[model samples]
Target: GSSGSSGPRTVKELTVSAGDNLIITLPDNEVELKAFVAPAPPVETTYNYEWNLISHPTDYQGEIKQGHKQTLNLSQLSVGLYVFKVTVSSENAFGEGFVNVTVKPARSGPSSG
Candidate 1:
């Protein structure tokens, strides 16, 4: 038998892409984040999820909604950066995660001359 085995992460990092937190582009688009937990509470569990946009671009005008659940489909987000802090607590396990969202407008093409 294995002497030691790794366990679940203590502080999860909610990521969108493969490398880093790089999601959404300057367009009619939105960003989405969902909480993840392994071996969810098996015995009559009632998980609780909380997400907050702790910090973001000062000059911003967007909408954030339904952060109380495990997922947030934030839309109408302008081009900029957004910081998020999420926590999940329930009957079995509890943990927190942070997400960094970034947006950039594609360079305009050459003017039609």
Candidate 2:
């Protein structure tokens, strides 16, 4: 709600980390998932976008920007592992391109460093 933006138009990945306040256990909650894209070389612009939640693990065409985080709540569903992916699209006079985002549960967990 800080960005004042409605919903993400795209998504890239799901990140589970310590809560923003980090005062208590995060328990995979208070985490955000998102997809995003930035202009590559030859293309220059800040019109980043984000997609809305497509389902429990997939997102739609909504575009997302890098460094921006989107939240995903999975408490209602099963408590196992989920695979999430996001497709990136590039468009302009240079034509178009695409990318992929696949996120699985932490195999070894995030580094504490």
lDDT of 1 by residue, 1-113 (tens): 77996876454333321124756765755777877655454577656667767778877754565387777768777778887777776543566677788877665675477
Residue 9, model 2: Cα distance from true site in angstroms: 26
| Window of ten residues with lowest summed lDDT in model 1 | 11-20
Q: Which candidate is the best by TM-score?
A: 1
Candidate 2: list runs displaced more than 4 Å. Answer: 1-30, 36-75, 92-113
Give me the runs in candidate 1 sitting further than 4 Å from their true place: 1-20, 91-93, 110-113
> Where is model 2 poorest over a 10-residue stretch in terms of lDDT?
16-25
> How well does each candidate superpose onto the true structure, as a TM-score?
0.66, 0.27
Task: Evaluate all candidate structures by whole-model CA lDDT and list the values in order.
Answer: 0.65, 0.32
* TM-score, prediction 1: 0.66
- 46 Cα displacement, candidate 2 (Å): 5.1
